[PDB]
Design a protein around this nucleic acid. Structure first.
Length: 1036
RNA sequence: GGUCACUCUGCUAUUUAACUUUACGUUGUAGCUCCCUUUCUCGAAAGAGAACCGUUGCUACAAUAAGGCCGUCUGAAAAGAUGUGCCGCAACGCUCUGCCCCUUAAAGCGCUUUAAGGGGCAUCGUUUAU
DNA sequence: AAGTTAAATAGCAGAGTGACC
DNA sequence: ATATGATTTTA
DNA sequence: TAAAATCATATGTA
């Protein structure tokens, strides 16, 4: 039918695609089609959406399980006769339960307690049980946490429980255990009847029990599969077999490079070393150097060799053998002199058992019978294993033998399986199959691939199977020798710096080495304050804080460039502010000039020095997801897609640097606010990028000192752009491609866009004077496809619950803390008039600190008693909020704003349009809404919709719509619908920033509109065609 | 010779998914408590006392998506007892269900019916736990 | 905040085979 | 980003 | 005035 290369530029958000027609020498002759497919949507303002779902489900479990254990505690209190049914209300709660639990917790140590008093203490210890340590483990004059809490905390601070403001007490669960049994004894000897034996054990286990983090197939479910025998799981790294396989790949692959040449190790040397890491803790390179004698002109190939004792670094360490050994030796079931008396298959079985299970229950469960209980408990007392190799225990059982008998890794694998490449599914299909999805546990990457494949099979259905697919990956053009050995130098010292700082950390006692290694950069003095921090107390959580100077709240940076250290005093009164906004802005100030000082004077990198002191949009984020998408797609297309191409390999994996360089050479270097359509342009440059060009460029930058970023070589002689050496696919590439990808000629963006078929053909005809092959059948103008989003799922409501007692008159109220209370908020404080002295005092303090409550309320604020005496402190005050709508929450005791408008149902009556919003929560409770928007009015008085009204369609986010005003005509992707306004927002396809507010038309009215119809479009941006629904769909 | 892809290993820099807990925060309700509008009561008046409502501080208890379920024991039933009790903000997918959109053939006069095929998106099916 | 896990890729290095220029 | 209150301009 | 545009503000944390 037609011979085309299909180019792809795939990003986190988009896939641009191009088709270039080729002769039978496969040279590219002409540009056919191009397009851009966007599927953007995400980023809670700042991580993932799947992550948000995760943390929801996490808390739902914590929530449920605490409620549940407290329920079972009430039940237990009844069954052991502490309570007698006349103390329980209808709902199951205890009647007249004392609100005194801290004071009775203390007092119980000295008196017998009322059944209700005792009940209250127990429920209190169960509800707040403190944190239990969950990593491997193998005060004085106060008696119990309650007493310490009450006596010290209530006297000094005026509160027991913590607050974000003053965080005092956190208690260990082991501490509260101590307390529990202490009260059980003290209470028995003071004649408490309910020291009821079963209740002691019951209460204690509800306190102490939490589910295990990893139990059953938890680990097997996440664990990958063997390169070679793909039915069997990967082998644990702490296996006899696997540790041995590593030691042999190291040993065989080892070379010594002497005065002149390079040589393998002789069978004799392989026998000399084979048993040496089993005989010691570890075999360093120095020890190898002596045992083989070598010389001193002989060196080891590929080992560092700097200005350090580089051969001190361990050549091989059998971690698991020595771990199991040391375990037995430490419990006196093995001689430190004698070797470990357990068979390979048993070291394997135990290594895996620990690596795939963590509960003592599970791992005995698998070891009981195969190993003797004495040593089982020994190991269980001391062993923790993680990490897996890439090959099964099985395939290794077969390989490691052949590698002992001299063979190289590839020779062993080739003998057993045919090749060392691993078992692949190569089943070429016409249409790219589904991505496995079992095999990618990362939903952003999965969606990007899945869209990429919908584009691919789109162009296969429209134009048949391509010759070749060209994909842009994230790798860098081959580097020069000097380049990559300096890359290696700096990688090496990254390692070497982490041990240096780690060592001096160990000296005194991930997060941790950063704290210490940042003390030194700042010459120790807290950046903001300038008091040279008490060297100690790197453990009092809140003293010295690893602060984000440029907020992660505004910047989206968690890199090693934006965390200044300081002590708790000055991280409080900054909130969400940059070091410049925090330290007094327009005019100088003590802390601002002390900050300018500290900054100039800090061994915090040259880059960062600029990055801490600046004065919007998060530039730089997840290229990791781009890498993965593209790498996997190249693998997947190469393995399982039919193509027409000349060779056996008809997928080319180009890269960014390549297309950047070629666009350099072909006169297309330019900036991107103009459109999302640049994604198509890069695609065609990708479709024209070739293997030849990859190699010519690679040899140019690697061997002839060409810059891999701008494509220029110094000479001393000048500096020249190696542009001539890489010609364009045809004579007028810049002109043709810019016109087809933008609708305008390359020279100036000012011109109207040839936004129609015949407009474009006339412009191409006119501007490419001499190129008749540019204009053909398949020359539509570029209309960007935006994937639709038709989930009825979503966040029910916002997480901030507000008082609904006055929802009556259109208001909620919430406690604004004083340190967040600005003048505008104070004007709606509820007791503004009920306590007018309060109002005037707050307004006074605010006006006095130039309306900055962070500083206005730093010193405590108090109510005064009219005789002039000081009374109660104020921390937060209740403030009225406008609330025309909302979601009833928390057992119908609160209201919260809506979160997600799932769809908008559109109706017609008398050539007028009416919109009914449907939110996620109505969906969840089956409510099919009733009332269309009416601009300046509560929903109570909105337009009710009966059989009188003609239903036209539903709108989901990113559905395509056309509106005709007598004023103008609009066509774009539905964005939002205003409750207060009854308008819609439209996203124009290419988000051309010059029209609307950055490509969104804000505030399109549709009530009077001559027409308002919903269209449908495909993945390439072609079959743009109106669609009319018959029935108004349910919500379930 | 070179370049690239892929396998294995060591490393440097990053990313993602799943899990178990904690301490807070929010709203509701109580008690004690700060202020304090209005209204009563006793004062000859300074004052004292009460009530609803607001609301400061501490402590407790409940709820912590909107919403849907499940085991096990008693029981004819009604219903009781009981649980390290479980789902719900993501993405994919087309075997079933539903909606939109093509295309072909037949038969009627741009539309419908039949038949078949194809595609998209889901409130359908999976990951996903009963 | 604490904590147990598995998965992926860009780069550097070491051992290999095989397509493509 | 979305949801939507508050304000201005057009018809 | 009704409808259409515009401006403006807020979002759970360790």
């Amino acid at each position: 039918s037609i011979n085309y290369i299909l180019g792809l530029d795939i990003g986190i958000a988009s896939v641009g695609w191009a088709m270039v027609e080729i002769d039978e020498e496969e040279n590219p002759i002409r540009l056919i089609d191009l397009g851009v497919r966007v599927f953007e949507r995400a980023e809670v303002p700042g991580d993932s959406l799947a992550m948000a779902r995760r943390l929801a489900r996490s808390v739902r479990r914590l929530t449920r399980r605490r409620a549940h254990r407290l329920l079972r505690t009430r039940r237990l209190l009844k069954r052991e006769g502490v309570l007698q049914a006349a103390n329980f209300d209808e709902n199951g709660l205890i009647k007249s339960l004392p609100n005194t639990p801290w004071q009775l917790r203390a007092a119980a140590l000295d008196r017998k307690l009322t059944p209700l008093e005792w009940s209250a203490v127990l429920l209190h210890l169960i509800k707040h049980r403190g944190y239990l340590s969950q990593r491997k483990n193998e005060t004085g004059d106060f008696r119990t946490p309650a007493e310490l809490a009450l006596n010290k905390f209530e006297k000094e601070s005026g509160h027991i429980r913590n607050q974000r403001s003053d965080y005092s007490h956190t208690f260990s669960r082991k501490d509260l255990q101590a307390e529990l049994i202490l009260l059980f004894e003290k209470q028995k000897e003071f004649g408490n009847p309910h020291v009821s034996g079963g209740l002691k054990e019951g209460i204690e286990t509800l306190l102490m029990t939490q589910r295990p983090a990893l139990s059953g197939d938890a680990v097997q479910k996440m664990l990958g599969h063997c390169t070679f025998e793909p039915a069997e799981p990967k082998a644990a790294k702490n296996t006899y077999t696997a540790e041995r396989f590593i030691w042999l790949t190291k040993l065989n692959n080892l070379r010594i490079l002497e005065q002149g040449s390079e040589r393998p190790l002789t069978d004799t040397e392989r026998a000399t070393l084979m048993d040496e890491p089993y005989r010691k803790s570890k075999l360093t390179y120095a020890q190898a150097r002596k045992l083989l004698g070598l010389e001193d002109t002989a060196f080891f190939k590929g080992l560092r060799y700097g200005k350090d004792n580089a051969e001190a670094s361990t050549l091989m360490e059998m971690k698991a053998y020595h771990a199991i050994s040391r375990a037995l030796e430490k419990e006196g079931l093995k001689d430190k002199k004698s070797p470990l008396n357990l068979s390979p298959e048993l070291q394997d079985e135990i290594g895996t058992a620990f690596s795939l299970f963590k509960t003592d229950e599970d791992i005995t469960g698998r070891l009981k019978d195969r190993i003797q209980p004495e040593i089982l408990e020994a190991l269980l007392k001391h062993i923790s294993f993680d990490k897996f190799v890439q090959i099964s225990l099985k395939a290794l059982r077969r390989i490691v033998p052949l590698m002992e008998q001299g063979k190289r890794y590839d020779e062993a694998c080739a003998e057993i399986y045919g090749d060392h490449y691993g078992k692949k599914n190569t089943e070429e299909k016409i249409y790219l199959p589904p991505i496995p999805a079992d095999e990618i546990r990362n939903p952003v990457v999965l969606r990007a691939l899945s869209q990429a494949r919908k584009v691919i099979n789109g162009v296969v259905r429209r134009y048949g199977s391509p010759a070749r697919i060209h994909i842009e990956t994230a790798r860098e053009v081959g580097k020069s020798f000097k380049d990559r050995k300096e890359i290696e130098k700096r990688q090496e010292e990254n390692r070497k710096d982490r041990e240096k700082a780690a060592a001096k950390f160990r000296e005194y006692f991930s997060k941790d080495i950063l704290k210490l290694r940042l003390y030194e950069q700042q010459h120790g003095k807290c950046l903001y304050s300038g008091k040279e921090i008490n060297l100690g107390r790197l453990n009092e959580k809140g003293y010295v804080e690893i602060d984000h100077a440029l907020p992660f709240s505004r910047t989206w940076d968690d890199s090693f460039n934006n965390k200044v250290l300081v002590l708790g005093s000055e991280n409080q009164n900054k909130g969400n502010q940059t070091p410049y906004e925090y330290f007094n802005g327009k005019d100088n100030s003590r802390e601002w000039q002390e900050f300018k000082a500290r900054v100039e004077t800090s061994r915090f990198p040259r880059s960062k020095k600029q990055r801490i002191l600046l004065q919007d949009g998060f530039k730089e984020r997840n290229l990791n997801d781009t890498r993965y998408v593209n790498r996997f797609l190249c693998q997947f297309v190469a393995d399982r897609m039919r193509l027409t191409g000349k060779g056996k390999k008809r997928v080319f994996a180009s890269n960014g640097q390549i297309t950047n360089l070629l666009r350099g050479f072909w006169g297309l270097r330019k900036v991107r606010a103009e459109n999302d359509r640049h994604h198509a342009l890069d695609a065609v440059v990708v479709a024209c990028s070739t293997v030849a060009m990859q190699q010519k460029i690679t040899r140019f930058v690697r061997y002839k000192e060409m810059n891999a970023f701008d494509g220029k070589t110094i000479d001393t002689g000048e500096v020249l752009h190696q542009k001539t050496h890489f010609p364009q696919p045809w004579e007028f590439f810049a002109q043709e491609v810019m016109i087809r990808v933008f609708g305008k000629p390359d020279g100036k963006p000012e011109f109207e866009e040839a936004d129609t078929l015949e407009k474009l053909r006339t412009l191409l005809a006119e501007k490419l004077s001499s190129r008749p092959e540019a204009v053909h059948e398949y020359v539509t103008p570029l209309f960007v496809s935006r994937a639709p989003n038709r989930k009825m799922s979503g966040q029910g409501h916002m997480e901030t619950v507000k008082s609904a007692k006055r929802l009556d008159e259109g208001v909620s109220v919430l406690r604004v803390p004083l340190t967040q209370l600005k003048l505008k908020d104070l004007e709606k404080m509820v007791n503004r008039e009920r306590e007018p002295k309060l109002y005037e005092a707050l307004k006074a303090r605010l006006e006095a600190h130039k309306d900055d409550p962070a500083k206005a309320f730093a010193e405590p604020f108090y109510k005064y008693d009219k005789a002039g005496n000081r009374t109660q402190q104020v921390k937060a005050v209740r403030v009225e909020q406008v609330q025309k709508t909302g979601v009833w929450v928390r057992n119908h005791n609160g209201i919260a704003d809506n979160a997600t408008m799932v769809r908008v149902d559109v109706f017609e009556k008398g050539d007028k349009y009416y919109l009914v919003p449907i939110y996620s929560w109505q969906v969840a409770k089956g409510i099919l809404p009733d009332r269309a928007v009416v601009q300046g009015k509560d929903e109570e008085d909105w337009q009710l919709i009966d059989d009188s009204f003609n239903f036209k369609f539903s709108l989901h986010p990113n559905d395509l719509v056309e509106v005709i005003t007598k004023k103008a005509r609009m066509f774009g992707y539905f964005a939002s619908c205003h409750r207060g306004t009854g308008n819609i927002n439209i996203r124009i396809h290419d988000l051309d920033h010059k029209i609307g507010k950055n490509g969104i038309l804000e505030g399109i009215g549709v009530k009077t509109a001559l027409s308002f119809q919903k269209y449908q479009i495909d993945e390439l941006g072609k079959e743009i065609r109106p669609c009319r629904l018959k029935k108004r769909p349910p919500v379930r």
